[PDB]
Amino acid sequence: SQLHVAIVSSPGMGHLIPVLVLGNRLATHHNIKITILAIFLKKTTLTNEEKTIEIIPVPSVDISHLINSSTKIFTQLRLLVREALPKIHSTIASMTHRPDALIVDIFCTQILPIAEEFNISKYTYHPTTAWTLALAIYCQVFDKEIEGEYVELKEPLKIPGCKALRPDDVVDPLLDRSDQQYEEYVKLGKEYTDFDGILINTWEDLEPETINALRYNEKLRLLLKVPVFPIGPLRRKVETTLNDEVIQWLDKQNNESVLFVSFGSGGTLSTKQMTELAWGLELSQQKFVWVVRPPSDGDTRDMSEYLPEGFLTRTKDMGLVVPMWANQVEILSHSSVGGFLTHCGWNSTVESLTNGVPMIAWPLHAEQKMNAAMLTEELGVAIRPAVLPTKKLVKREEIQGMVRILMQTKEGKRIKEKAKKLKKSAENALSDGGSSYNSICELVKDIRSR
């Protein structure tokens, strides 16, 4: 009898999409019915709605009467999935067949009551790195061990068995201990250890030390005590879009000649930074494609209105400007792309490595500042500015230099060849026999034992 698995998605595409990918992986490879309780580029269940993949909508509660302007995104996203858990309660109460296992998103951990009530096998998804996970867990200890803000720390934080996290590479919920988002994060870290397992969007080669720290380190296993499932790198699969001007232009460009630039669906620069980045791209004398959003200094505008005067005119031959959105996976896969300036968001990161593309780390929010150091210091597949671009403007001199490096210098060629090897490792973990294929089959096992 085919297993029935429910998956729960936090709001947004950066949360919904992974969930979908995950679902498709499972269902394609092992034969499992996938229901999703979500709270020309995609088309969701294209033909996947043959009692195979099925998306039930449940995104219904306002929080306007409970937040303010300064309330941080993490807390907001924690609230949304709380206001009316009852909705979810009754949703699962009205499932004609209860699932044999439920897999909730990182921000839908507060659903334990329900999972316990219907007595279903409950699992959590961590859509980013294991290192960030290890932190999220161990933060329940630091909370006490360190007195004062974490950015004030003179020495790094050393998570048992894991690399040392500097005061500059902290995750955002640790920037302010006097906000609520910190408390939520420690609560999160405490919640993980109640689930029957933890899926993580990574593989062995990429994070061997960290994964084997979570699994085996005594100090961590006195907190964790649950299995861990490195199932990644899970990513959207390259779609087909005949008409896609970006592509049509890229088809005229040489192999690995282009640098792609896009800061993900959350990212937004400030006006000056955008001007310096423009002049940087101009002065580099390198070919590029740039997904530009309106510049928030906290702005619906035409492309000319927010970019430097004559920029588009001058760069007409050297670059392609793309307002708002560009189809990210398809560009990343394309032969003429040999570079990616990114916000270090894990989804995008994964998409880059899986195509063997070197990166320029430009962290902005979330955990991205922590992922940047991991890419650069440890993995050597990315470079970054001298000062993190959150703390200080990155002017056109350092930008120019950083561009020329990645693309045409021999060191640039070393970093690319590194990304390529990590692409292979990804294609080895995912393959029929790899660590992540097998690790999935361990999750399968564990859902049948329950």
Tokens of 423: 């692409």
Question: Of residues 30, 100, 105, 172, which has the active-site annotation?
Answer: 105
**Among all chains, which residue has been given the structure tokens 């609560």?**
187
Q: How many CB atoms lie within 10 A of CB 171?
A: 22
Q: What are phi and psi of 101, to 5 degrees?
A: -155, 140
Q: Please indicate whether residue 105 is annotated as part of the active site.
A: yes
Per DSSP (E only), the strands in 238-286 are: 258-262
Q: Name the helix (H) or strand (E) containing 412.
A: helix 410-429
Beta strands in 268-409 (DSSP E): 287-292, 319-323, 337-342, 359-361, 382-383
Instruction: Write the DSSP string, 84-150.
Output: THHHHHHHHHT-SS--SEEEE-TT-GGGHHHHHHTT-EEEEEE-S-HHHHHHHHHHHHHHHHS-S-S
Does the annotation list 236 as a binding residue? yes
Phi, psi torsion values for 134, nearest 5 degrees: -45, -45
Residue found by looking up tokens 């962290």 in the block: 363
Are β-strands 258-262 and 287-292 bridged in parallel, bridged antiparallel, or unpaired?
parallel
> Which of the 8 DSSP states describes residue 386?
S
Q: Is 348 annotated as a binding residue?
A: yes
Give bridge partners of residue 35 from the DSSP assignment: 6, 54
Is 204 known as a binding-site position? no
Q: Is 360 helix (H, G, I), strand (E, B) or coil?
A: strand
Q: Is position 335 annotated in a ligand binding site?
A: no
Residue 404 assigned ligand-binding role: no
What's the longest Cα–Cα distance across the chain?
A: 65
For tokens 């004030």, name the residue: 152
Phi, psi at 253, each rounded to 5°: -95, 155
**What tokens does 196 get?**
């029957």
Q: Which helix (H) or strand (E) holds 239?
A: none
Residue type, 319: G
Known catalytic membership, residue 15: yes
Q: Which of 358, 374, 351 is nearest to 409 (CA)?
A: 358
Domains of the chain and CATH, by start = 3-236+431-449 (3.40.50.2000), 245-427 (3.40.50.2000)
Paired tokens of 243: 């008409």
Angstrom distance (rounded) from CA 361 to CA 349:
9
Helices and strands per DSSP (H, E), number in the chain: 18, 15
The closest of 23, 40, 228, 223 to 123, measured between CA atoms, is 228
CA distance 59 to 410: 50
Cα dihedral sign for 336, 321, 342, 188?
Answer: negative
- For residue 332, the Cα-to-chain-centroid distance in whole angstroms is 16
Outline where DSSP puts E strands in 190-293: 198-200, 228-230, 258-262, 287-292
| Ligand-binding site membership of 4 (annotated) | no
Q: Residue 329 is inside which H or E element, if any?
A: helix 328-333
CA distance 287 to 324: 20
Cβ-based burial of 407 (10 A; exposed 0-12, middle 13-18, buried ≥19): buried
Rounded-to-integer distance, Cα 143 and Cα 182, Å = 10
The rounded distance, in Å, linking the Cα atoms of 201 and 212 is: 15
Q: How far apart are CA 14 and CA 245, in angstroms?
A: 24
What count of residues does the chain have? 450
Within a 13 Å sphere around the CA of 442, how many CA atoms are in the beta-carbon half? 16
257 is in an annotated binding site: no
